[PDB]
Amino acid sequence: RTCESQSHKFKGPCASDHNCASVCQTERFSGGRCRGFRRRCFCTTHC
């Protein structure tokens, strides 16, 4: 299932999708992006 989650690990707001993604991918396996842009970073994975 396409599963989405939140990234409270990333520092502050969404500096850049690719950045929060890289972080979220370096710690775990979950592709990360931001709600719209700049707002808040969510990570997607298979739950």
Automatic annotation (TrEMBL):
This is Defensin MtDef4.2. The keyword Signal applies. Keywords: Antimicrobial, Disulfide bond, Fungicide, Signal. Disulfide bonds join C3-C47, C14-C34, C20-C41, C24-C43. Residues 2-47 form the Knottins-like domain. Coiled coil: none annotated. One of its GO terms (biological process) is defense response to fungus.
